Each structure stands twice: as C-alpha cells, then as structure tokens.
Amino acid sequence: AEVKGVCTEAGMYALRERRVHVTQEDFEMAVAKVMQKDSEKNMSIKKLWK
Amino acid sequence: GADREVQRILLELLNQMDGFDQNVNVKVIMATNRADTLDPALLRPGRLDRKIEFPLPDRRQKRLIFSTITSKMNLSEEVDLEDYVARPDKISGADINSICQESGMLAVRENRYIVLAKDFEKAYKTVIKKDEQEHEFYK
Amino acid sequence: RYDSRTTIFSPEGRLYQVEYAMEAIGHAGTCLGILANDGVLLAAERRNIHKLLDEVFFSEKIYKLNEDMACSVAGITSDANVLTNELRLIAQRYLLQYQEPIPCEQLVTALCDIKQAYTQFGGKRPFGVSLLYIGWDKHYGFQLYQSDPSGNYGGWKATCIGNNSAAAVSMLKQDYKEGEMTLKSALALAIKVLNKTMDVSKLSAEKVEIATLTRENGKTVIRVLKQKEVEQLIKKHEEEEAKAEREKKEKEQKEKDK
Amino acid sequence: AAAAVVEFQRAQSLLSTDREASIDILHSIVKRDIQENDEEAVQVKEQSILELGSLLAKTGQAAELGGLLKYVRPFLNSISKAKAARLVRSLLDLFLDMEAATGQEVELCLECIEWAKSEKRTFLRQALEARLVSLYFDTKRYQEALHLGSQLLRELKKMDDKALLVEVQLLESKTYHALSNLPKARAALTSARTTANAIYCPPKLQATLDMQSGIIHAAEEKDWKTAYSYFYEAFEGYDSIDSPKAITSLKYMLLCKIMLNTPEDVQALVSGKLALRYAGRQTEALKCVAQASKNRSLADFEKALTDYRAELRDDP
Amino acid sequence: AERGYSFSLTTFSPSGKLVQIEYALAAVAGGAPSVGIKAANGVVLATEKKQKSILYDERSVHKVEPITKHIGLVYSGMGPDYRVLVHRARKLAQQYYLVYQEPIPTAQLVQRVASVMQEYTQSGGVRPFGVSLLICGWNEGRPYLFQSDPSGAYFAWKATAMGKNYVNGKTFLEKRYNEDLELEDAIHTAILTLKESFEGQMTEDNIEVGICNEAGFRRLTPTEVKDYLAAIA
Amino acid sequence: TTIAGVVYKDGIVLGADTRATEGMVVADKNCSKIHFISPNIYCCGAGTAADTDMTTQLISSNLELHSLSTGRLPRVVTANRMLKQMLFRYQGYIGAALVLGGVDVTGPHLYSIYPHGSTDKLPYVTMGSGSLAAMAVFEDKFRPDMEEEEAKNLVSEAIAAGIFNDLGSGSNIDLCVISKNKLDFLRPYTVPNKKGTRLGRYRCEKGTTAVLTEKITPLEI
Amino acid sequence: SAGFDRHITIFSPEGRLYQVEYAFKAINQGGLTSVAVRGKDCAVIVTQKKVPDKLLDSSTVTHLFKITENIGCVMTGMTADSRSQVQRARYEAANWKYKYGYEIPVDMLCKRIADISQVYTQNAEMRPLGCCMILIGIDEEQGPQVYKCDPAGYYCGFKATAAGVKQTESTSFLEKKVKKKFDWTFEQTVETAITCLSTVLSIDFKPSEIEVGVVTVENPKFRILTEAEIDAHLVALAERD
C-alpha cells in the first residue's frame, strides 16, 4: 500500500505542474511525503528507557 | 464488550473504505484533532488516507481571516485590523470570528452606530483572556 | 488478577510482574557482549542520538564497576543508575574487606540477590533493568555474565540483551567460534551483528558504543573505543560487505554465462 | 589599537569633509603590511579596505574596485575562519550598487568566481555565483542567468548553506517569471519555500520569498487576496529592514487592491500607520489609478497612465 | 489502553510501562515555557513569568534561581515541587562543598537531584515530582546544561525547550542554534524562542532570564532584560 | 593563637595572627585564622584548629543556604546564634573560641563566642592565648568611632603585642576590614618577623646518598 | 477521567491533581470572603464577619489572627483548618526568631507554610487542609507586604488579593482600581478594600459585619480596628466619596 501510494503521490506531483511526466525527483518527493513518521515528541518519555 | 465494539466499528470503517468491494467515485474526508492516536491501518498511506494539517493561523493567514470576516461587516476608517493581526497570540479562526461578532454586538448593544477600534480592543481582550481562570500551581 | 503485586503467585506458579519486567527489558537499547580468549567486549546502540543532545558523558550504557569489571545496562534509566551505584558499592565493600578485587561472579551474585529481594518483598516493583557484565578475575580469567530483572544470572561466551536480542543472539550462535575467537574477530563480529540488528540504515558510528577489557602487563584495562576506531571498524565491515556483494555479482554473471 | 582607531576617526572625518585625504590615508593603510603574529593589525587592514571601498562608492569612484580585489586577494586567506567571504561579498555588492553604470560588472564577477575556484574557497565561489546570477537577472540576460542558476542549484542541493540554496531557487523562479514560463516559476518558488521552511530565514530573505510568492500568485492563480497577503508580508519585512524594496511592495499591495475591484481601500491603506514614510509619486500614481477606476473613466485612466508613466509603466 | 496499570507506581503494566511517571511528564509538558541554550562561552536559561493578573507582584517569587556561585536552575512544571527541588539541590551542593572543599560539579549536582527524583518515584504513597529541571553550570572550563525529569533520568543538552510549546521551541532551536554561539547571541536566541511561544506582549518584567558564564550564575536584572528585549525588537 | 576585633566608625576590623603549634613546636607558619562566613561576615578562630575550622565551615554553609533562601544579606545576629547554639549543644568539647564580626543592614556587629556557647556582643574583643595582651592594647588605645585606617593600625598593634608577648602566637598578621561597601581581606597585613636570612650552604651534591633499588615507572602522557 | 480523583498523589492522564483542586473548592466553602490591599506604607486585610446568632460571642468569632507582633493573617476556609494553620504559622515564626535572632520576614513565613502544604500535597498522610491564608506585614527593606499561602504550595506576593467565594469579582475590581494610581494612602487603601467587599457582596456594611486588620510603616504592629474605627472609616469615606 505504501508503494502504491508512492506511485500515486508522484503522479499527483506531476499533475500539479500540468504534466503527464514522472521523474526520479518526483518519486523521491513522493517517498518522503508518504513515509512520514510521527516519532515520539518528548525527549523525556523517549529517554525513560536506556 | 465496549472496547471490542468500538474496535468493531473501526474495523467496519476500514473494510468499507478499502476492501473487497472497491468503491467507484466515492471519496472520504475525515477530520480530527490529532492523527497520532489514529489506527495504523486507517492511517495506512494507501487507499485509506492522504494526510493534511490545519495549523493555527499564521500572521498572514490571520490578516486574511480578519479581512474575510470583516468584508461583509462595515466599520469606521480608524479601526485598522492591520495591527490586531500583528499583535502576538494563538487565536484561531474561530477566535477571530468570535472577536468580530463580539465587537459588532458591543457596538449594537451600546448604540453608537459604528464599530470602532475601542470595540475591537474590548472584544479582542475578552476573547484572548477567556482562556484563563485555571489553577496557578500547575504552572 | 495475579499481577497487581510483585509478591503474588499465579495459580500456575508464575510471577507475572517479574515476567512483565523481563519482557519490558525489550524496550532498552540493544547491548551485546562477546568473550574472546584475548579479551572480552561489549557493544551497545544509542537509541536516541538527537543532534541537539550533548555528549557530556563518555558512555551512556557502559559503566566501569571497578578496576577489573564493566557492565552495560539495558532498561529503565533510574533503576540502571541505582544498580550501577550499588554495584560499585558492592565491589568496593568487597575490596575493603578482603584487599583484592571482587570476582565477577560474586559481584553478579550480590546484585542479583538484591534484585531477587526486590522481586520477593513487599511493595517494591522489580528492577526493570538487565545487565551485561564483563570482567577479569584471578580464578576464571575473562568472563561475561548476563543478569535479568528477576535476579537470575548466567555466564555466556556471547550474548545480547535489549532490542532485537533474539536476532543478535541467533547471529552470534551462527557465527561464533566456541574457542578460537580473538579480540579482533570479536570486534568484527560485534560490528556485523550490530549492523544486522539495529535495522536503521547504515551503521552510523555515532549511534554505537563499544568497550573492550583486556589484560596488559598484569593489569586489566577497560577502553571505550574512540569514535575514530569505531568508524574504522564500521568502514572495514562495509568494505567486507561490498567485497562479498561483488563476489556474489560475479557469481551471478558466471551463472548467466552458463 | 588606540592609534589605529585614531587614524580611523581621522579618516572618517576626512570622508565626511575632505574625501581625498581620507582616500589617500586609507590607500596607505591598505598598502601597509600585517605582522603574522599580531591578529589586530589584520582587522585594522580589513576595516581600512572596507572604508576605502565605502569612500569609492560614496564618491562614485567605482573604477578602482577591480584593483582593490586584485591586491586584496593575495591575502593571508585566514580572516576569522570560514567567514572571510562576508567581507568580499559586501565589497562586491557595494561595487555593483554603483549609481552610474561603469560597464564592467559581468566579467569582473566572472573573474572573481574564477579566482575563488582557483583558490578552492568553495563557499565564497558559491556566493559569487549567486551574485552573478542576480546580476544576470538585473541586466536582463535571463537565459544565461537561468543556465548559471540551474548549475549552481544542482551543485547546492547536495551541501550546506541552505540559505544560499533558497536564494538561488528564488532567483530561478524569478527568471522563469521574467521569461513567462509561469508554471516553472511557480515550481521553483514552491521548491524555494519548501527549502526555506527548514532553516532560519532572516527578515530580508523572508521578505524576498513573500514578495516573489505574491508576484507569482498575482500572475498565475488570480487570487489577488493571497497576492495582497504575500505583498503585505514582504512590505512588513522590508520595512523592518528599512530596505528600499518597500515602495515596490506598497505599490503591489495597492495594485492588488485595485484589481480586487475595491479601489476605495487604496486611499484607506495609503492613509495607514505604516504607509506614510513612503508617500510620494509612487503611491500617488496608484491613488490616481484607483480614482480613475472608481470613476470608471477610460479617459481618466489613460490620463493617469501618461501622467505617472514613470511609476505605472516601466515596471512590468 | 492498559487502564488498570495507571494508578500505581510499584507495578509494571503488561507492556512494561510505568504509566504514572509518564503522567507526571505530561504535567511537566503542561507547564510554562522555559528554554535553555548552551552558548560557546556560557549558558542561558529563560522562562515566561507571565502572571494571571496585574495584582500578582511579579518580583517576589522567582523561577530562575541560583544553587551555587556557578550553578543555576529553571523549571517547567509545578512551582511547589520546584521549590522543594531547589531547596534539596542547594542542600546537596552544600553537603558536597563541606565534604570536598570544592564547588559541586554541575554533572554531580544533576546526578544527585535526579537521585532525589528517583527516591520520590519509587513508592505508592508518594507522588513523583511534577517538574522538569534545567540546570546550568560552569564547572571546569566549559559550560554544562542538563535536564532532569520526574523519572530520575538526566540529560545533557546543547539547547532545548520545555513546557507548553516545547515542540515549536525545539524546531526553532534546530533552525537557529549553532554550536559556536557567543553567550550574547544565545541570550537573543533564548528570548526569541520564548517569543515564538509567548502570548501577549513580552514585557521586561514578565520574563525571567538567567545567565551562567565564567563569572558565575546570575539572574539578569529586569533592566538588563528590558535592554535585551529592546535590542532584539 | 591571638585574634582580635574592633568596631570602628563605618564597620569592623578583625585581625589574627598566623601560627598553629602542635604542642610547643611551630607546626604551621601561615595558618589562616580569619574564616569566611558570608561576604559581610568573618570570624577569627582560636583553640582547637580542626574544631574551629569545621565549625566555621558548617556555619558558613548554613548561613549561605539561609541567604539563598531569603534573598538578602545574612545577619551577624543569625551567624552568632547559629554558632552559640551549636557550641552549646556540644557541652564544651568543640574547643572553638570565635571572634565573629560582620556588617549587616543594621550596622556593624562584633561578638565574642566562647567554647561553651556564651557570646558577648562588644565594641572590641580579643581571644586566644594572647587575648590578654591584645585586650591590654585595646583598653590602652581604643576610642569610640575611629577611622578605618586608625582601627586597622590599632588592631594590627594589638595582634603584634600578642605576637611579641605570647608564645604560640603567629608570625604574620592577617586583617579583615569589613564595611557596608568594602570587604578588604589583607593576607598578610604585616610581617613583623621573618626567618633569618639563611646563613648556611648545605645542599648535598648528587651521589651523597646511597641507594639500593629503583622502580622508575614511565607514566603515560 | 474520574478514576484519578480519590488520591492526592495520583496524576491524571493529563497531569492534574484533582484532590488539590478540591481543596481549593473547600476554600470556597466557608461562605465568607477576604480582601487585602497594600498602599505606600500600609497593608490592610478586611474580612466578611458573619455572626448568625445572638448567642454567639462575636469577640471569639473572628478570622484575623496575630501571627507575631508585626505579622497578621486573615484566614478563609474551614475554621478548624484555619486555626491549625495559624498555630503552625505562629510556631514557625517563633522558631525563626529563636534560631536566627530576628523577626521572620513575611515572605519567608509564607514560603515555610507553602512548603508545609506542598509536603501534604506530595505524600499521602493527611488531606491538604482546605484554608487560604493571607499574610500582611512591614518589611524593613521592602515595605508593606501582602502574601497568600493557598493549600498547594503556591505563595506569590500581591499588590492586592482576595479569597473566598467572590475572589474573582474582588480580583477584577482590584485590577481596575490598581491600574489607576496604585499609589494608595492609609485611608485610600481602607477605602479600596472596604469598597471592594461591599461592591462584590452587593451590600453596604454595618460597622460590625466587617473585620479589618492593619499594619503601617509608622506603627508596624498588626492592629485590629475597633468598632468605632470601622464606623468612622465607613461613615467618613461614604460621605466624602
């Protein structure tokens, strides 16, 4: 599902710039946008455990 | 049974949003206060969600909110919102709308058939200070 | 429900709170240790390596218990600090009494007895920290031990605690030479297993800490390898992996020709 | 450095009153050499070089900047550490800020870049290349500006000075807008904004980004509300910095107000708290245009255009 | 979630959480913004002293307090717990001074204060300290900035923010902080980080800032804070 | 040991000698006998050196914690009461006889605290073995409200009389002039005596001593 | 979140101490109200005095206590808790004077009482006694001082404060009156306090249904104004207002 979303979001990047064209930059930006992680915010709760 | 039924509701939602019966031209929008507590399956960056953030208005966006809200309203010529926007705060769009409504209500209640900088000042103070009256050892 | 207290037996005879602590150890940063006939060593991962953190302390998980012993902690930070201080106190009490360093097994037994008392007595939750001890004593030479939240300890040639400990221990089991492992090979194996267990991109040197204990001129020396040495080891491992991949590619090309 | 500071103050008084004596004194002070052990005479010399360039710019003697660079490049090459680029950047900026076109800017900047490349001062070379791209855009050599900017940003995406990367991407967007490739200008602008919302953006850089975003929004989407918002943000930033690129932001806000079919607000906005220091023909042109639009008079509109040709026309 | 295992501090939840200490950390995060930046030649601590009214005499209760001639401390969280912890820190520093005729190192003071917090987070009849401390010292020849949590864990920081908007503060510090930053620039960075999460007008007398350089920790006077605010604005 | 203190116009001047004797042999030549209690409070110590040293250290720590808590300068009354109560709790085994002196908000205060915990607030005090000679000088040449320089001279002369007429008194004279503004700590204020210029030449050349073993260990860098 | 409510030492999932908040609710339970204001050189506390019976000795009924010769307090909340905390404050002041040789500063006594209360808020041995103490005194270097010692360990110092049922209304009134010439005299401060109480309670005071304690720089001894003085203040200031 993440890979299909990567393809879809690269296609959406292409659509934004009135394009029908996908490039390596488009796939890389799609990967960044889709695999966005909401890691822990608080360093204290993160560092409770050694 | 209650937690299990809530999970059942979520499972049915996942099913219907992306499952054996792929919908045609049926789009979905879901609004939330935080997406961190959301289920990974529903949050699945696939055929279930594309994520967008609605942050608190920036200064520029606050200028736009004030302009839009006040366009329909009519005011004096010395009532510049151009600095009420610049005054720092964490007021949201609902807060700005409440400020405008309260200033208009102030003017109509006190007759004074204009809306002026003093009305906006009082409404702004009221709305911004509404977030108080909590306990002070917590801070 | 048989887990509301540390001093409650399940109807099957299981201390669910002690088991909870044992499982919870899995949140801790992966630490591991290898024993070599030349010396012994620990490696450990830095779970949190934020760029705004300072590096005031030379080691976050590896502590020096006395002249002839070090230990890596894995678990709750407060409990780990308490137990490190208590280990130092135990070792120095033994040294005061007998005028010779506490043997590693005795030190491990003392701390594990403390842990057992915590698991057994009153309203005290068990120490949620596992420990890896390395040391040298006049009786059994280089030794490596592991200790659990329950106060149970064992002696190991190679082992791993914390995150992905199952994968790390399986890898060591596969690729550890029971009696022909030197310190250089031990360091190489440690880097290999850490690379394959951390599961975070390339093996960043700043995200790993390695310590080695060895006898030299009749005195034990515990050295936490500098970042330069760690980087060199990681680079050598990466070169080895690249060479293996080149060999596999050449084999694939030969198979294609065939 | 009490005697040095006294010499500086004497040169400053002569800059104010008798500029030629100051020029000669600073020329001698720059000719002076620096003890390798003393790290304060070096500061004295760099300050003297800067003030000599200031004298040249103030007097319009922009013909000597080439010599200044030529005999200051063979320097110790250790000013501060990794921040000596600031002095040369400011020197070149002041040189090109000449009020009279000396005619030798492009090739001089090119030889500066070549010298930086030879000396292996990569960061200074990147700064010089960005300055050269901006110079190309200013002189309307848009194709060469775009070629050099594309090369520079390709180099810059993979290293530090994300502020310079943002400036170069903004220049790329601006050259696309000037060349009418609006979708590519917007793409470059969006890339610049994405890079900029990951670092500290000084008020000047934020104002530049906001003004370019407003310009592009006015050009392409026809959301003059958002264009006006961005133009106001740029105006505020340039006002805080007290930059001369604030009359332009004011003019563009008044233009957005006109195109929103609400020219009544042009006078109310010009009669604002912040829109008073900039009063003049610049704001009067657009006040007249708003009045002509309010009266809906084509004759009045053309009258305003011809009367204020300098303000309303010649600014594309 | 694990609902049953959240009222006690002497029981592990099935997944290993100690939920009550995380709740204490939530109490910390729901506190006044405070910022700490470790400059190249010093350290700076700031924290909003915004009062709930004009009646509160904002010169009586301080939030950035000294602990020694070379150590100071700010907090985010509950003020009473902060008072307890600052008193204990002063007592520990004095004990260290009496034993070793030498000012306590900042690292050691942080260790001992974290030990105190651990003592308070290991029973059922005691509530963990609902504060996070930011300790700033000038031990040796270099500055130290440490954090201490209710859990008894202590960190060394380059720069950090805690309180209501710690996420925004940390992003801002990532953008703005550079290692080779003089204390004078670090003070401006601290005040700007506060401004980014400070509602209302940041007047000189509703913000509290303390510096720690080789001359020793010192809480800047309101006149000095006014000068810094004017220079920043 | 000889220590003295006199309250002059603006503030106080304390003055001690420098010597600690282990029995009847000079053990220390430069013992510091004027101990710090707070920036405005100093106490001269006499009697058992360890007792007085650690007593002043403990009271200084307590008073500094007190000052940090309150937020204002400590008071000589506070220091005096702390010392008095401690020395009384110890029924007299803390052989620390102190001359406390400071300048708080309420002017200058000078106390004479005794080992058993009996304090005499006085304009001028003297304590130690030479306390009798110091008080002789004070009685003979003390006046109300003397200037700072005159008070320094008086206390220095009293301590010098103690030095020259009491065995077990110091070599150097240390002073501490405290006032609402200044905290001069003169160390040493004067050197009434100094070892006679070494008249011998005895350094023995290398090889004079007979060695048996060597274990030169090359310490790492 | 109601499970995290029966124990003083349990943090709510969002980090709140509901039992401490309930102690504050207990403050707002005696029905009475108290106000305090400091001028240039005086501090004044005024408390509503209810004596709802002819058989109740009004002399014994009171909420103004003399903590020491130069420090006074007005207590609002449960009466038993108020008197217990008053005894504790007197004991702490006596100990301070014994140990350190000078009278306890008002801010120091407030910090001591606040620390005592914080101890109960942290450990689970007592309930946090539900009373609010407003202390007034004359500090030789600072001047008049008014402080609060709420039952959670918070003790900020005040230009003017209130406690009890109408603390919010009194706070708003005093904010308005202090934004304009906070510099008050003795008579002006007594005026401000009495007027604040009267306006918030929506009643004009008899000389008896009010109790006033005062400290002044000229006379820095806590004095409880008599009925004649209270009546004089009320009549004169109402007339000349």
Curated annotation (Swiss-Prot), chain A:
**Organism per entry:** Homo sapiens (Human)
Record-stated family:
Belongs to the AAA ATPase family.
Q: Which residues of the full protein are shown?
A: 357 to 406 of 406
> What subcellular locations does the record give?
Cytoplasm; Nucleus
Q: What does this protein do?
A: Component of the 26S proteasome, a multiprotein complex involved in the ATP-dependent degradation of ubiquitinated proteins. This complex plays a key role in the maintenance of protein homeostasis by removing misfolded or damaged proteins, which could impair cellular functions, and by removing proteins whose functions are no longer required. Therefore, the proteasome participates in numerous cellular processes, including cell cycle progression, apoptosis, or DNA damage repair.
The protein's name: 26S proteasome regulatory subunit 8
Assembly information from the UniProt record: Component of the 19S proteasome regulatory particle complex. The 26S proteasome consists of a 20S core particle (CP) and two 19S regulatory subunits (RP). The regulatory particle is made of a lid composed of 9 subunits, a base containing 6 ATPases including PSMC5 and few additional components. Component of a complex with USP49 and RUVBL1. Interacts with PRPF19. Interacts with TRIM5. Interacts with NDC80. Interacts with PAAF1. Interacts, in vitro, with the thyroid hormone receptor (in a thyroid hormone T3-dependent manner) and with retinoid X receptor (RXR). Interacts with ERCC6.
In terms of superkingdom, the source organism counts as: Eukaryota
UniProtKB/Swiss-Prot annotation, chain E:
- Where does this one sit in the cell? Cytoplasm; Nucleus
Q: List the Pfam families.
A: Proteasome, Proteasome_A_N
Query: What keywords are assigned to this protein?
Result: Acetylation, Cytoplasm, Nucleus, Phosphoprotein, Proteasome
Q: Which residues carry this modification: N-acetylalanine?
A: 1
Stimuli inducing this protein: Down-regulated by antioxidants BO-653 and probucol. Down-regulated in response to enterovirus 71 (EV71) infection (at protein level).
The species this protein belongs to is: Homo sapiens
Q: What is this protein called?
A: Proteasome subunit alpha type-2
* The keyword Cytoplasm is assigned to this record: yes
Family indicated by similarity: Belongs to the peptidase T1A family.
Q: Where Phosphotyrosine occurs along the chain? A: 5, 23, 75, 120
NCBIfam families per the UniProt record, alphabetical: PRK03996.1
Q: What does this protein do?
A: Component of the 20S core proteasome complex involved in the proteolytic degradation of most intracellular proteins. This complex plays numerous essential roles within the cell by associating with different regulatory particles. Associated with two 19S regulatory particles, forms the 26S proteasome and thus participates in the ATP-dependent degradation of ubiquitinated proteins.
Q: Which InterPro entries match?
A: Ntn_hydrolases_N, Proteasome_alpha, Proteasome_alpha-type, Proteasome_asu_N, Proteasome_sua/b
Identify the SMART domains for this entry: Proteasome_A_N
Record has Transmembrane helix as a keyword: no
Record-annotated membrane-spanning stretches: none
From Swiss-Prot, chain F:
**Which reaction is this enzyme known to catalyze?**
Cleavage of peptide bonds with very broad specificity
- Among its keywords, does the record have NAD? no
Expression by tissue: Expressed at a low level in colonic mucosa. Up-regulated in colorectal cancer tissues.
Query: Which top-rank group of organisms is this from?
Result: Eukaryota
The positions flagged as active site in the entry are 1
As for subcellular location, the record says:
Cytoplasm; Nucleus
Q: Does the keyword Protein transport apply?
A: no
An example Gene Ontology biological process: proteasome-mediated ubiquitin-dependent protein catabolic process
Enzyme Commission number(s) from the entry: 3.4.25.1
What terms describe the molecular function in GO for this protein? endopeptidase activity; threonine-type endopeptidase activity
Annotated GO CC locations: cilium; cytoplasm; cytosol; extracellular region; ficolin-1-rich granule lumen; nuclear body; nucleoplasm; nucleus
Alphabetically sorted, this entry's keywords are: Cytoplasm, Host-virus interaction, Hydrolase, Nucleus, Protease, Proteasome, Threonine protease, Zymogen
Subunit and partners:
The 26S proteasome consists of a 20S proteasome core and two 19S regulatory subunits. The 20S proteasome core is a barrel-shaped complex made of 28 subunits that are arranged in four stacked rings. The two outer rings are each formed by seven alpha subunits, and the two inner rings are formed by seven beta subunits. The proteolytic activity is exerted by three beta-subunits PSMB5, PSMB6 and PSMB7. (Microbial infection) Interacts with HIV-1 Tat protein.
Q: Which family, according to the similarity comment?
A: Belongs to the peptidase T1B family.
Identify this protein by name.
Answer: Proteasome subunit beta type-7
Organism of derivation: Homo sapiens (Human)
Upper taxonomic classification of the species?
Eukaryota, Metazoa, Chordata, Craniata, Vertebrata
UniProtKB/Swiss-Prot annotation, chain G:
Task: Give the function comment from the record.
Answer: Component of the 20S core proteasome complex involved in the proteolytic degradation of most intracellular proteins. This complex plays numerous essential roles within the cell by associating with different regulatory particles. Associated with two 19S regulatory particles, forms the 26S proteasome and thus participates in the ATP-dependent degradation of ubiquitinated proteins.
* Alphabetized Pfam families for the sequence: Proteasome, Proteasome_A_N
Listed PROSITE patterns: PROTEASOME_ALPHA_1, PROTEASOME_ALPHA_2
Q: Which family does it belong to?
A: Belongs to the peptidase T1A family.
Residues modified as Phosphotyrosine are 154
Q: How does it assemble?
A: The 26S proteasome consists of a 20S proteasome core and two 19S regulatory subunits. The 20S proteasome core is a barrel-shaped complex made of 28 subunits that are arranged in four stacked rings. The two outer rings are each formed by seven alpha subunits, and the two inner rings are formed by seven beta subunits. The proteolytic activity is exerted by three beta-subunits PSMB5, PSMB6 and PSMB7. Interacts with ALKBH4.
Residues with the modification Phosphoserine, per the entry, are 12, 58-59
- State its location(s): Cytoplasm; Nucleus
Query: One GO biological process from the UniProt record?
Result: proteasome-mediated ubiquitin-dependent protein catabolic process
Q: Which Gene3D superfamilies match?
A: Glutamine Phosphoribosylpyrophosphate, subunit 1, domain 1
Supply the PANTHER family for this chain.
Answer: PROTEASOME SUBUNIT ALPHA/BETA (PTHR11599)
Protein name as annotated: Proteasome subunit alpha type-6
Give the gene name.
PSMA6
A GO molecular function assigned to this protein is: RNA binding
Judging by the UniProt lineage, the source's domain of life is Eukaryota
Native species = Homo sapiens (Human)
SMART domains given for it? Proteasome_A_N
Residues carrying N6-acetyllysine: 97, 99
Extract one GO cellular component term from the record.
ribosome
